[PDB]
Structure 1
Amino acid sequence: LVIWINGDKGYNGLAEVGKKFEKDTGIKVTVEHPDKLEEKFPQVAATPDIIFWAHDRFGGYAQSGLLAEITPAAAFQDKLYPFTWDAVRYNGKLIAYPIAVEALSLIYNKDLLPNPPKTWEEIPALDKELKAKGKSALMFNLQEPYFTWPLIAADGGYAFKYAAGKYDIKDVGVDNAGAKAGLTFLVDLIKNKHMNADTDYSIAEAAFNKGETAMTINGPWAWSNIDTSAVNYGVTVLPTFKGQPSKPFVGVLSAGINAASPNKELAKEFLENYLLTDEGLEAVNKDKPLGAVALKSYEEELAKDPRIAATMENAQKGEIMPNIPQMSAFWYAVRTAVINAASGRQTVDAALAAAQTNAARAAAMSVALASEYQLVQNAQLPQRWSQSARKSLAILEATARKEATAQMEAAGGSFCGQFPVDPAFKVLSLEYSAPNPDIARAIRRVDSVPNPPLPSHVVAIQSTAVDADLSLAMGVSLTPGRHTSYLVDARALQQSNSAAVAARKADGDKWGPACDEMFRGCRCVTGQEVVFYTAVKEPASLFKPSFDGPAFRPSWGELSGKATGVVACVLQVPIGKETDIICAEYDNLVSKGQFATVDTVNMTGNALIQNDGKAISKGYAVAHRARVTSNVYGKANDVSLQRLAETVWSVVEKRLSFMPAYRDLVITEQGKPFMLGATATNIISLTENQGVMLHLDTDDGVWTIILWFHRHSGIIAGGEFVLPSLGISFQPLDFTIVVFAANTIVHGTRPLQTTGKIIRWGSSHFLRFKDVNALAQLGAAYGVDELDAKQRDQLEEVDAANSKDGVGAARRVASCMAAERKAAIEAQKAACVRGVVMNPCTGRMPSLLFWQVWRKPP
């Protein structure tokens, strides 16, 4: 049993609970507190056995089938308050165990305020009295609607209408009279000087803990801090409004079991019998406060503390937070409404009118986007496969193999350019000659060892008929008679990915002994053109093929009941006109200073570096400046970048016809202007004789392109590109390109040592989706073509400020532009503007595309 829980909880106490579990049963409990837990669970669970989080996010996990249905006996359900069970019900089924209950309360300073107001209506009078002594009645975080909603909801008003175990995303309750009344009262307190419309979390928490305000509104997480102050304080029921209870949202900390866990009946034993007990929860409570708990017996003990009783009281008068993803539409719309109404930028009536309409609209769009993503993940390539076609293609491929074999006889061997290719050997070092100003040419194998065999989960395809089947179905067309296709068992690929990551961690995040051991089992494919397909078995996983898709009849029976997908392809580009163009643009952009140094690696392309406050258009800072300062042609670098991306993309697409289909599928109309030309590339890297640790990428597109070329002569040892879960590695020769699914295939580059002046230039062409989303969003807010003018303006205003009042005054102006840009992006992001299609579950692109289902019934 592996359990993840947040770092601000009592995990060591929960680890003690796990220790009492390993004594009675011979089962160890290991408790991690991973960072970024909110988002890291839905990313990894899609591909711990127990997860500890607020119930509201578990509805989303349930929609994605990341949780097990919990089946407690009605005798165990009686140990817990019934509302806490509603917290953990998605679509009629129980999806987690309730642990703790949490809601806002009224917190008051006893010395300033022995009898706290029962009602909101007596607060302005009470602020009068307090104002005499230079103190305020009430100060709380007005910036986040989680805090102001209790008041707004009191007289009616709700997020989404609950009915028949479901939230109706179309029925928003922001706009009614009850809500208007509540918000009107809130802004009235501001317009009568009682509350300051600027007050946030920190301001309110400072003021109360120093004795400047009599009351604050906060939750149990805040008690610790007050405990360190000179304040004598209580915690009580929230004030009523028009005689109704303030209605705060209730968050129920819950424990859900992973749907992909083999450990279901022994996590059920652990949580029902070792944590949900008085000694179980107290163990955890000693480590860290829980506030109110769901377990009736222990709650009765904690309720002896008035603060805890007050929490449960406010919780029972409140509303349980909807466990659906569309709460984000609700929150953003209401946050804007409250900020506007409180600043006088809108009438209360106008603010809630717009919030209602916007939330409804955004909630609808998010559902539309979820259904569209499914069609993206399930989309098929234009059909070229047929039994006649694959037979025809196999003949053609078979003819090409005889030709290549005759060429190989006539020439005395196999060659990639001038480099001798012999798969009996593994190329550990190699020599390049630079006889002219063109690219240095790979000429001679220097060091070698016998070439390791393929690992057992990777098979070379021998049959031309099978070659044809995959080629047609997968949009791959490698050099006829001069390539090798491989099939990789999908389960073993995922296991080997984890082993590779483990090795890199054990080596201390570098190429060390564990990575080297793996490398020694990697077979060399230097000088080869190859493709790897992974085959997913029908469940009857890291990869998500739809087994409801159309099926083809394979000539190979072993493919039946499986789906294939392209995970990697190595091309050897013949030195010529395209390599001239590509290499020239690198040289142009290097000379003209258009590569920015980053976290090392140089980058160029259509970035949006938000850390640069004054950035408001596509490209790195040097690119913004070159458009303005040039005295010949302002778009020159943009022309050079587009030719660079398009020439690489063209060379790749000749061989891999799925690539344009992937481009057309994932780039939205709003994203197209921010790609480099008609490609799926928006960022291009450049490295000089550099290795990189084994890793998966996370926030890139489905496939990434990597290329290399060489400048002077000399010898390179090491520097192989390694794909350890595919069991292969290679030295880049004249112009090697790899196209691969970098979010799902571990990959890295070993350190190099050189003799002579030789430079190996490496370059990744990839889709960094955050930049294209932010830019698509800026395009929506300002107009695509207006960005250049805005960039030109913002550069002048900042230079003027720097030229007039110094660096600090300039960075103040940048800071101003950043906040304005941030506001514009946020509003478009909330209106669901996107540059790319993304998994709403993961916030990432799909793990692969264009799965083909094979079935051979008899």
Structure 2
Amino acid sequence: IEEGKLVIWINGDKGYNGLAEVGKKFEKDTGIKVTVEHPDKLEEKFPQVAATGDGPDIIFWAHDRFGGYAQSGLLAEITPAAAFQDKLYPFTWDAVRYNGKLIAYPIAVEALSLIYNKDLLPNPPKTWEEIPALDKELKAKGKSALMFNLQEPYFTWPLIAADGGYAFKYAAGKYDIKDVGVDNAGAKAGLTFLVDLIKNKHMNADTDYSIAEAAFNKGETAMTINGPWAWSNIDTSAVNYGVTVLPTFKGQPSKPFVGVLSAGINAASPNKELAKEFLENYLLTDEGLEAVNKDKPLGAVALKSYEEELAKDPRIAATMENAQKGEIMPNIPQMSAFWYAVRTAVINAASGRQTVDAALAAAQTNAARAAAMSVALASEYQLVQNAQLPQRWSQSARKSLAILEATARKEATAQMEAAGGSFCGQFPVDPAFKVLSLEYSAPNPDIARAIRRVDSVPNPPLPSHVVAIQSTAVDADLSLAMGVSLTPGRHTSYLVDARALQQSNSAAVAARKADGDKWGPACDEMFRGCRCVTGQEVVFYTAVKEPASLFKPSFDGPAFRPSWGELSGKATGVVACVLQVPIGKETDIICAEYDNLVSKGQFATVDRFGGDHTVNMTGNALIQNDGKAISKGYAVAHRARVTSNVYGKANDVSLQRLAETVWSVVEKRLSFMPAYRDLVITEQGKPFMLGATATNIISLTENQGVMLHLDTDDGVWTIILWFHRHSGIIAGGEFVLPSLGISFQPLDFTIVVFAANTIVHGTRPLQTTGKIIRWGSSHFLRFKDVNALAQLGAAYGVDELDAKQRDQLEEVDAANSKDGVGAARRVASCMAAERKAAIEAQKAACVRGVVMNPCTGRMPSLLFWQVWRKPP
């Protein structure tokens, strides 16, 4: 975020061009440019980007999300003067309070109202109880009294709450998540009246949003229930309509939920006081809200002076009236427990699957249980973020290891002189040069061997934020504290400043976007500054300074005393390691499994990043797109377990060996890897990993470049390997880590292990001469699949998934033989809906395959941070 500027995020369905005019008027008076953007998935994108000290200066969203944001410290406490607070309705300030602190400015107010057809019904009923009689007369005329969305509890809640239902009890400025108000007498009476309407055929259990909107907008029903977002569509229709206060129930007002569109200030913003004056003196004025409202209407508004103007529209007045009779939507993440439980209960009470009593009793206990587990998971997550490696570090152990490392450096130097140079396999290694292209030979049917540097340039120097560690003492410090044990005397360790690492990450993404999501001239310019480490074994540690960010070390953790004073007040984590695997039995096994899975047709071909490149995938996916998928694997894997006439599990044995052999090679150098696996894979997720690894998906590419990118929904560390087939020369195709300032050509069997959702990376396009093929493959954790599979396991039994898969393949085929392609798709669609409903139930019970950040919905940015402190 740039100081001296203001960037605003607001959803695309709002008047952003009108807001831009307020910023343009702001830029005139003070010289501060205001940029309004409307990113997609704004509710998801803001907590992900704000948690890293980045993102907008101001966020516009429904107030209910902002308590979640405040729990994570993403929002600044706003400080309106008492005079300014008087300009806005009191209840709107209540909607933007967390922990007794104001955390946002209210802007607009929305709630459900009663919408009625003036020709069908000149005087709409003041009470719910009149509606059955009124419906009887309208039925005689070929109409109905009322249709509205019964599928979503947002729409049915006003009736359920009228006589006493509530979500979470509010007291002393806090929501008590132990106190859910779904099971009291008022809620029961509300839901009962609703189902009595259905039972007496006044309403249909099937009516959803689309059916009710189409019915009201065509003149078929006299009333609906909807919010101000629905008025535009009625305004194109022929219906003469009004908007009024919801009916009462037992003489009590219906209590719709109230959503307050609010502007909050990013905690990481350097422009807090500028954002405050823009919001107070420019937006929250009559002129300000007008400019927005003219673009797209705000509805009702929190600013009293402008709301008195808007309320001349009876639809606005009704909106604010129902809002003031309503229930401010609770601003805590545990509302998700509430929504799922009440949605289920209303659907079951309406269909007859449960009585009202049974439906609400289960919703009460299930929402409270789910809300509780949500808290337990959120506190458990802080423990995994702050967890420490088994302690092997000590001053005594540091020194012993330094001496061993120092001995090995002399051995390596001796056999370097004896041999005439440095080699990785048969490839001559010279750090003075950058390997722009290189030759491979294939003398026998084993893997092709890197033999000769062809094109080169002088090797660029390390960027300023990356420094090679010279000291065996420092090397031993980091090796013991970080769980890294590279080839003694034949590796280089680097320290990378965390702040500069983050900036360089941003510069790299900027370049890729400026190039048109491709390796173009901006990416090439970065590449020309990358230092080649081809043939080397290296590890990069990032050092985070103690806040006197992308990375979240716990500076309350145990501290070691570094040999190097410059580590003091810093925490280190492992962001990347490059290994060179000597060819032998393990590379034989790995290469053979890739060949077996290719020959047997077990790779699913897919395209990534649009059409950036082609990737083949295998492993324990769950492609929910495939309606009949109900077990681990791509569709080819599901089929092979049934159609094989030899051994149904053969490919699962092949995949486990493939994952475990790669894992084993890596674990020998990187002892933190099994600790990471043990820390983040749940008991419920373990059966859906490939063997005893943190890998569930394996990719495979063939002579493919990949644009620079961050992965997002993968694990904390990713493994990538390469191996070659046939002879030839490869130009380009480097793996590039531009935020670390390095790149390399893969040789006989190079592996990189790195933090793929945190370190930008990609692969340059290549040109080949001869038959040479460079095979690349990622082993990674794609946590969506393991979560959905862990959820399916809890619903049906882990071992029952193969039987379900078998049956579902069998009856999709039967439909295709009997009634053709269209019937088969109908059966698969029914299977998907059954599957979906099973997954949601288990997801609602907090069944999980991996531990995840509740705020970001992603895995931690790093693990196993070690704090260093050198007191004098």
Q: TM over 0.5: same fold?
A: yes
DSSP 3-state at the match of 2:77: coil
Q: How many angstroms apart in 1 are the aligned matches of 2:560 and 2:116?
A: 70
Partners of 2:254 and 2:795 lie apart in 1 by 37
Deviation digits for residues 439-469 of structure 1 (CA, Å, limit 9, x no counterpart): 0000000000000000000000000000000
State which of 690, 707, 710 in structure 2 corresponds to 1:676. 690
Matched residues in 2 for 1:526 and 1:739: separation?
Answer: 15
Distance 2:827 2:287 in 1: 57
Deviations 1:271-303 (A, max 9, x none): 000000000000000000111100010000001
Deviation string, structure 1 residues 687-711 (Cα, Å, up to 9, x no partner): 0000000000000000000000000
Q: Decide which of 590, 597, 620 is 1:582's aligned counterpart.
A: 590
Query: Which digits, 9 at most, give the CA deviation of each residue in 1:69-108, with x for residues without a partner?
Result: 0001001000000110010000010000000000000000
Match of 2:137?
Answer: 129
Q: Distance in 2 between matches of 1:314 and 1:792?
A: 53
- Deviation per CA, 1:194-226: give whole Å up to 9, x if none: 000000000000000000000000001111111
User: How far has the Cα of 1:655 moved from its partner?
Assistant: 0.2
What does residue 650 of structure 2 align with? Answer: 636
Quote how far apart the aligned CAs of 1:262 are: 0.4
In 2, Cα distance between equivalents of 1:350 and 1:406? 80
The SS at the match of 2:261 is strand
State the Cα deviation string for residues 248-283 of structure 1 (Å, max 9, x = none). Answer: 000000000000010001000100000000000000
The 5 A counterparts of 1:446-465 are: 446-465=454-473
How far apart are the structure 1 equivalents of 2:361 and 2:548? Answer: 50
Give the C-alpha shift of residue 362 in structure 1.
0.1
Q: Deviations over 1:295-346 (max 9, x none)?
A: 0100000010000000000000001000000000000000000000000000
Q: CA offset at residue 550 of structure 1?
A: 0.3
Q: How far does residue 631 in structure 1 lie from its aligned partner after superposition?
A: 0.6
Shift of 1:475: 0.1
1:295 aligned to which of 303, 307, 316: 303
- 2:51 corresponds to which of 43, 46, 49: 46
Separation (CA, whole Å) in 2 of partners of 1:75 and 1:303: 23
Shift of residue 651, structure 1, vs aligned partner: 0.1
Counterpart of 2:586 in 1: which secondary structure? helix
Q: Kindly, what percent of the aligned residue pairs are identical? A: 100
Residue in 2 that maps onto 1:809: 823
Q: Displacement, 1:173?
A: 0.6
Q: What per-residue deviation string (whole Å, max 9, x for no partner) do you get for residues 403-430 of structure 1?
A: 0000100000000000000000000000
1:206 to 207, 214, 230: 214
Query: Counterpart of 1:495 in 2: which secondary structure?
Result: helix
Is 1:719 the counterpart of 2:733? The answer is: yes
Separation (CA, whole Å) in 1 of partners of 2:627 and 2:27: 53
For each residue in 1:338-367, what CA deviation from the matched residue of structure 2 results, as whole angstroms up to 9, or x when unmatched? 000000000000000000000000000000
Cα deviation digits, residues 28-59 of structure 1 (max 9, x gap) = 00000001001000000000100000000000
Task: Output the aligned Cα RMSD.
Answer: 0.3
CA distance in 2, matches of 1:607, 1:19: 49
SS state at 2:238 partner: coil
Give how far 1:157 is off: 1.0
Structure 2 match to 1:619: 633
Aligned-partner Cα distance in 2 for 1:134–1:852: 74
Q: Following TM superposition, by how much is the alpha carbon of 1:837 offset from its aligned partner in structure 2, in angstroms?
A: 0.1
Distance 2:164 2:548 in 1: 49
What is the alpha-carbon distance in structure 1 between the residues aligned to residue 561 and residue 465 of structure 2? 23
Deviation string, structure 1 residues 8-38 (Cα, Å, up to 9, x no partner)? 0000000000010011101000000001001
Match of 2:678?
Answer: 664
TM-score (norm 1): 1.00
What is the CA–CA distance in structure 2 between the aligned matches of 1:155 and 1:23, rounded to whole Å? 52
Q: Which of these residues, 33, 37, 41, is aligned with residue 42 of structure 2?
A: 37
Deviation at 1:481, TM superposition (A): 0.1
Match of 2:15 in 1: 10
- For residues 39 and 27 of structure 1, what CA distance do their matches in structure 2 show? 28
Q: For 1:809 and 1:104, locate their aligned partners in 2 and report how far apart those are by CA, in whole Å.
A: 40
After superposition, what is the alpha-carbon deviation per residue over 1:90-129, rounded to whole angstroms, capped at 9, x for unaligned?
A: 0010000000000000000000011000000000000001
3-state DSSP class of the match of 1:785? helix
Which whole-Å CA distance do the structure 1 matches of 2:640 and 2:360 have between them?
Answer: 46
In 2, Cα distance between equivalents of 1:512 and 1:856: 46
Secondary structure of the equivalent of 2:253? coil
Shift of 1:139: 0.4
1:738 counterpart residue number: 752
Distance 2:29 2:279 in 1: 14
Runs of 4+ in 1 over 4 A off after TM superposition: none
Deviations 1:485-534 (A, max 9, x none): 00000000000000000000000000000000000000000000000000
Q: Cα offset for 1:766?
A: 0.2
Instruction: Identify the match of residue 56 of structure 1 among 41, 64, 87.
Output: 64
1:621-671 per-residue CA deviation (whole Å, 9 max, x = no partner) reads 000000000010000000000000000000000000000000000000000
CA distance in 1 between counterparts of 2:30 and 2:137 reads: 63
Q: Does 1:391 align with 2:399?
A: yes
- C-alpha distance in 2, partners of 1:290/1:430? 62
1:782-837 alpha-carbon deviations (Å, 9 max, x no partner): 00000001101001101111011101010111111000000000000000000000
Deviation string 1:696-730 (CA, Å, 9 cap, x unpaired) is 00000000000000000000000000000000000
| Secondary structure class of the residue paired with 2:751 | strand
Distance 1:634 1:297 in 2: 73
Q: Distance in 2 between matches of 1:394 and 1:430?
A: 35
1:541 matched to which residue of 2?
Answer: 549
Task: Answer yes or no: is 1:334 the counterpart of 2:342.
Answer: yes
Distance 1:236 1:11 in 2: 29
The answer for the alignment partner of 1:26 in structure 2 is: 31
Q: How many Å separate the matches in 1 of 2:105 and 2:787? A: 37
User: Residues of 2 paired with 1:157 and 1:36: CA distance?
Assistant: 32
What is the DSSP-based 3-state SS (H/G/I as helix, E as strand, rest coil) of the residue aligned with 2:480? Answer: helix
Give the Cα–Cα distance (whole angstroms) in 2 for the partners of residues 153 and 800 of structure 1: 48
Number of aligned residue pairs: 857
Q: Which of the residues 229, 233, 239 maps onto 2:237?
A: 229
Unaligned 5+ residue runs, structure 1? none
2:628 and 2:232 map into 1 onto residues whose CA distance is 40
Displacement of 1:538: 0.2
Q: Partners in 1 of 2:627 and 2:854 — Cα distance? A: 29
Residues 1:218 and 2:223 are matched in the alignment: no
| Of 353, 356, 359, the match for 1:351 | 359
Matched, 1:510 2:518: yes
Secondary structure (helix, strand or coil) at the match of 2:595 reads helix
Equivalent-residue separation in structure 1 for 2:175 and 2:23 (angstroms) = 36
Alpha-carbon distance between aligned partners in 1 of 2:233 and 2:165, rounded to the nearest angstrom: 32
Q: Within 5 A, what are the aligned runs for 1:238-637? A: 238-599=246-607, 601-637=615-651
Deviation, 1:540, is 1.9
- Normalising by the residue count of structure 2, what TM-score does the alignment of the two structures yield? 0.98
Q: Distance in 1 between matches of 2:275 and 2:773?
A: 55
Map 1:185-200 to 2 at 5 A.
185-200=193-208
Report the 3-state secondary structure (helix = DSSP H, G, I; strand = E; otherwise coil) of the residue aligned with 2:252. coil
**CA distance in structure 2 between the partners assigned to 1:188 and 1:212 by the alignment:** 22
Q: How far apart are the structure 2 equivalents of 1:135 and 1:393?
A: 86
Give me the whole-angstrom Cα distance separating, in 2, the residues matched to 1:791 and 1:24: 66
Task: Structure 2: give runs of 5+ residues left out of the alignment.
Answer: 1-5, 608-614
Structure 2 residue 715 is matched with structure 1 residue 701: yes
The answer to whether structure 1 residue 162 and structure 2 residue 170 are counterparts is yes
Q: Once the 2 structures are TM-superposed, how far is the Cα of residue 133 of structure 1 from its aligned partner? A: 1.1
The question of 1:760 aligning with 2:774 is answered yes
